[PDB]
Symmetry: D2
């Protein structure tokens, strides 16, 4: 596959009730190509007034007796499958847009992100008519059952590091369960979300079931978080804003909250691991998607006896990693998303030099247009360094050494985060002891970043709450109702 | 059974690490009998310094390799069953304490509250070794499974209207899942919870697994809600404090939050219901437990053709309702909990008279000592009256009229609350249509207040977040971990 | 839609390993049109040697490391969805074939049977990657989980009354779970099953995963039931043959057995039912599919006070029921399947007259070409009559009267069968009491023959064992393996 | 604990409807001590006439409106817990009976069998009120739910090798689900089951819910298997009789059937296993319970490089295994059950010698009284030998050698049985590849005979049908009913 030549950005308006609208204020905001710094287009800027219009449309679409509420659950599923068909048809267009707008190498957006999007919609297409309540053998002369209903209007806020994939992760389970949605893409990367609005219309979703509101965080995002007519919010982003979201839910209407936030995830390499394999997994585990990934394995603990060789191989690999234009097929790493993130990464790199970590390679920006940074490897990292504690979200690998299993379990768990973890060993007892002891929502054994539509994902500790993907991803998008019926005489 | 004669209050200290402790400040606080106003005893007053000690004890008991972590899940269940046996042995003592301290008629404390306590422990005793994760047929050469682990240190805050029962509702699922607990009873009603500490020690729970911290809201309660070493908080109480709890969770450490809060629940009586049964069920649905129940059916909608007869019968029932000493076996209604609640009820009664509802009977305090209120009935209630909107938590029945099913569904659902609802009709189509349309966590058909250990309970909208009881109550007290193992070759 | 003009039968051979094969013996057997008696075509006649070759192909396709075993579960689901797409593409052809071969009115095969086929494949397409095992908190220092594996080679035998729909009901869950299949359509109706083999190949199922073996019962069917290389058998047909199947499994290799067999199902009409609706539902409930349906409501019990009016309305409806050529859009009822069934029906009708049931209308064959029987209604049926006890499988309606709920529950359950039951009443207490007391696998309330892909179906008593459709339909097609791993130290 | 001095055998009669009855014929049968050959007592001999009375009693106890059918599910659970309490109270008496009657060393009966009995009853006590049906979001305007009802009268036939444990495994899930039971202990070992009747009466089960019918196979057992009034049969015993049971169910009334039958289970030892641990586990895995265990690891495959050392260590262990009086605390191995089993073992030992296996030690009877056999080890066993294919059920260990993982997987799976399997290795990849490839219902990794009340258990292939223990054990004892209600308008 090749990037779509001369990609037209057709959809730049607010999507409400299946109609393209200007912002109430008339304001628009610029969207950039992070690889060149040039403006790609302008987009209508949603603010609190547009959120209120979107919530009203989503609320009306959810009303008892509406098309969306009366629809067979199996037909909700068919609509998700139709949406997957349209994404597959437009796969190269959407991957080009993800590359252009988000800086991802086009072939990675096509084979990773877009494959994840399609598989997510197809997976949840299958769940819609398989969401079951229960019947319960309660005490007394009663018939008791549960109804698993949609919650209602779900507000969703997503970040710039996986714009389209996070859009799909959020709307697929919500729609699977029968909710309606007001979703706010990141101001950096609204474009593929807006294109999805055109596919949502083309697939035949009833108006108001999905409303897409491009805009800034403190305006549009905060309006969603505090809205008294939104029943549930899902947020993926920084831990700092996660706190604000949960606080705003409590101050407003006690909407249900799920969060996916930062990580500083440990990747533990025992001396019996295959080094060809573990070095490459650990390299991808921290450098994938320009380092802009919540799952980044940013604390690699390596057993002492293989530490020097592991560092040696990792440095050779980082020095070889190809940075360049996202449309070039040889590019492995594109730019960071913007100047703020670029500056944040360099400041943390500078703190690592100042705190005495060993800079093995990289450590500087490239002098090109856009926001490109050399693949950077630190060794001799220790637990109290800022780079060992703070999420970098950049192409910065950190390698630590350990001696014993009990020691590395303690150090791996000594974090306020707990998103993912990994252990590489062939010893069954160590693998299961370490994976059971990790305080993390996903633990990989002999792999890294193995995510699948079928398996739930989410944080321990301050990395978030709730799970996404899998069956358990549905639980955050339903409200349980118990119905208890007096009967004349109960028999088993 | 008879109230225990000359009940002495043996347990008045703070319970941490299975030992009885004085408050760090040295302060005690008085506990009163709401039927007489007399002081019953004094109890050690926990504050932030005591909460800090309790969290440390609970964290140590939760450490990997501890007695509580290593215990077979089936043996966690055995301990809950042993606790139930001890409650059963001491049922009269505990019911006497609930009557003396909480104002509940002794026979109701004995046959309702204590029965629910025993059944709750026995129910969750059976779940401990039946909490299952899953194995998942993910894409790719992987073996994927989930582990359902305890979260950690759970802080629990409970109110004064069901002191012992809410104690059991909170600690039983938490312990069943393997958590450790710091629990704060209401300052009005600490005594039965402290007695439970003695039984917890006698049953053999490891030290630090349950810690019981009597004290006030802004001191002990707020110290739990903002504690950075508490992983999860559960709260039952006012909507106003629930909002503060959820905000404090976001501001502090993003601890997981469940809430059970206010209600203004509708009870819908159709003309084809069994009338005398519906009158009695709706009477109990308002007046049970001195009206101090989150489930109170405080908006009774009666179809117009039976409205006058329903009111007349309801008024006759409320006039003969026996109000008196909780220890007297003829007493149906004890006092309200304290002067603050007493005054709140009286002011809402005045608002009902001022806004033109028809005071059919009652409406005043009874006697001079304690906090007794005449059973009160308002008819001709309309939806915009304060007594139709605000939770009263007193013995005040509100009766409204309606004409059509569509109308009453809309009016029932027009509420920021959504805790329970009921419909009385012999028509299967009406019953299913109304119960499916209610925006409430529990809907009763031809009954009211039918609560069972087996069935989940909780609020829609601002009545709460999450569910308690049943299998689903366990979901708030576990963390899901996904483990994904790379394998050489997958076969189905 | 309209019948495919001049339908040529393209597929007439045995389907093994995605190849079209002649019988090992060279023998063929004729296939007839039951509406004219004319021979439609000849089909290769499978016998024991052909079954043996098919089992070998299915076994090789199930080998560890094979394409079908290694495929992602989600990709097994995609293949079922592709098969559904192809059935939809060829819907009119397939409905024409079911009409020409089976006698079903074309419009019914198109809108009922073929819709069920498509919905069945699409439903199970969604389950394949959602079949989960469990992880278990066992006693001791162990990690225990379950794998739900396909059983292996499944033998399936289906009857002539729903040839294509039952073909789908059988193969869809078996393939969903990852099994391979040797399936034997009824000798009267092999044609649509053979066409499906072409679609199975076109969709891309690996060779040997589905093998289709047309032939006779005591030859091909018996060879499947006794085969020592078949792990599981599923049979739908007569109770008599079901007994032979279970016996043959015990005598041979103890293959797992599920059975769907006869019924004599009760349909209970209380005096408050809507007669316009209930008369039509009970009419369709006996007469659907020429009366050739296991779910037939062949014992209608009508409350005394509306019995005469119900009989009057039922007779009027039967007298207007249009019998004729299946291709005529106005036809409601086609012919019976063959002369043997035709003769069985008429002999039972004669038994009814001889035992004193009141023949209200019908009772004779129509005297044209083909096997057409007048729609027949008996009133004054009593429980001891042959027609009240024996499954007729023809267009014969039996109407009984009852007085009390206790009485009708006892008479309804006084059967060796227990496939289905129904109750028509608006009284919620009677509806739930009757439905709960029925000894039947499916109970309808205020409807009849409401079957859905999402709902499990199957018999109590001698109407069968196991369930089909829904999630539970999967349980008969997987084998549970428990894996228990010793670990150094368990923690919760 | 010590064996109970002066053990009186108090309960020797038939147990029907909670009454002790004489046999209808008047016959009694003798019961022997297999360590001495002496007669212990005589027991009333049930035959067809007694089965008939028991089925009538069980049917009446199951009728709608009976005490057992109306009981809260939670109270069925309380009765199982009470039965566990009484077994614990009488643990030493019951273990003395199992030792005296079954030949089990008393300490093994006390610490293994009786612990399993108690844990089984306590586990299923917790399931009774947690058996849930589902509510289902079907297509069309319907409300659909399932109820999981008890099947009815369950016949249960158990063997002599774990008399009390198998009695508990059978009646616990049946009663949990609400069935009634007619259970026939083995003629060799009726005593502990009859004692359980006294405890069942003492615990307070309603009359007729459990009926205990001591007697022989072709008389009492065949009467159960053929009974037209029994809904379900469960049988544990020989493969040959299991085939007869399944055939008899087909011939009689199509009762549902579960079977636990023979095994020839493989135990695979890789060179990288912990060798001394593996030797001891594999020794217990074949010699436990006098070798009379369906799970016996009677094909030990040892990787060639550790084969000679493994043989030498296994021979040393067998030569020191203490065979002697079951009441003696030094005894590890008691006698075989009776003269028939003794002779069958001796003949198979001769077969191994004749066919060229290396007799390393043992091979003859021990002493002159009772049925004691020397612990016997064969090495250089090959797959075609009779001792490698036929279940011995005696203290005969067989050791085989292998070279590759692919080879040992193929040889382990080349069997008509598939009850259990095990693999010993410290390599995670080999452990998971082998366990996934095994055609067996339980696979242990680095352990053997790790059985737990929480884990389901049962055979692949001819080792049986169905699963026992765990949640899945309940599925064989419930009947699923789908209830589908027409509703005016469906909303999600
Ligand atoms: N996958 C993730 O969890 C993820 C994604 C992006 C960034 N981060 C972390 O965040 C750091 C900073 O990046 P960022 O500033 O773009 O993250 P961010 O949290 O500010 O932005 C994520 C989303 O939150 C919206 N948002 C911002 N402020 C909001 C507010 N006050 N109220 C409601 N919504 C608001 C944003 O518009 C965007 O849609 C990064 O360095 C990284 O460490 C994590
Ligand atoms: C005995 Cl199994 C028998 O005759 N069964 C057929 C009953 C068919 C009822 C009408 C067809 C229903 C079509 N719908 C479906 O197949 C749904 Cl997908 Cl379950």
């Amino acid at each position: 596959p090749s990037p779509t030549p001369n990609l037209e950005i057709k959809y730049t308006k607010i999507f409400i009730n299946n109609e393209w609208q200007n912002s109430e204020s008339g304001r628009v905001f610029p969207v950039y190509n992070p690889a060149t710094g040039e403006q790609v287009c302008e987009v209508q800027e949603a603010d609190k007034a547009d959120i209120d219009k979107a919530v009203q449309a989503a609320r009306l679409a959810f009303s008892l007796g509406s098309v969306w509420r009366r629809m067979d659950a199996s037909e909700r599923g068919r609509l998700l499958d139709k949406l997957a068909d349209l994404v597959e048809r437009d796969r190269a267009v959407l991957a080009t847009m993800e590359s252009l707008n988000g800086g991802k190498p086009f072939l990675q957006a096509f084979y990773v992100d877009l494959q994840g999007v399609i598989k997510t919609f197809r997976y949840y297409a299958g769940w819609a008519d398989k969401i079951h309540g229960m019947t319960i053998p309660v005490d007394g002369d009663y018939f008791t059952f549960t109804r698993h209903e949609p919650i209602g209007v779900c507000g969703q806020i997503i970040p710039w590091n996986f714009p389209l994939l996070m859009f799909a992760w959020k709307i697929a389970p919500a729609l699977c369960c029968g909710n309606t949605v007001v979703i706010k893409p990141a101001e950096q990367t609204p474009l593929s979300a807006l294109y999805m609005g055109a596919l949502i219309k083309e697939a035949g979703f009833p108006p108001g079931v999905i409303n897409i509101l491009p805009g800034y965080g403190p305006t549009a995002g905060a309006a969603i978080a505090s809205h008294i007519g939104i029943d549930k919010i899902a947020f993926t982003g920084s831990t700092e804003v996660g706190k604000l979201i949960q606080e705003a839910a409590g101050r407003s209407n006690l909407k249900r909250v799920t969060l996916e936030l930062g990580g500083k995830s440990p990747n533990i390499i025992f001396a019996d691991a295959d080094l060809d394999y573990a070095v490459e997994q650990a390299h991808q585990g921290v450098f994938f998607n320009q380092g802009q990934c919540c799952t980044a394995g940013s604390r690699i603990f390596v057993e002492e006896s293989i530490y020097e060789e592991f560092v040696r191989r990792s440095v050779e690999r980082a020095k070889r990693r190809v940075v360049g234009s996202p449309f070039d097929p040889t590019t492995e790493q594109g730019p960071q998303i913007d100047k703020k993130q670029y500056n944040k990464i360099l400041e943390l790199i500078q703190s690592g030099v100042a705190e005495g970590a060993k800079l093995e390679c990289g450590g500087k920006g490239l002098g090109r247009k856009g926001f490109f940074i050399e693949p950077t490897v630190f060794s001799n990292v220790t637990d109290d360094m800022r780079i060992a504690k703070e999420e970098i979200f950049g192409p910065v690998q950190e390698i630590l050494r350990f001696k014993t299993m009990d020691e590395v379990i303690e150090r791996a768990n000594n974090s306020d985060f707990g998103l993912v973890a990994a252990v590489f060993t062939n010893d069954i007892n160590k693998a299961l002891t370490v994976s059971s002891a990790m305080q993390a929502g996903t633990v990989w054994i002999n792999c890294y970043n193995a995510l699948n539509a079928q398996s739930p994902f989410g944080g321990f500790k301050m990395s978030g709450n709730g799970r996404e993907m899998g069956e358990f991803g549905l639980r955050e998008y339903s409200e349980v109702k118990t119905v208890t019926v007096k009967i004349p005489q109960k028999n088993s």
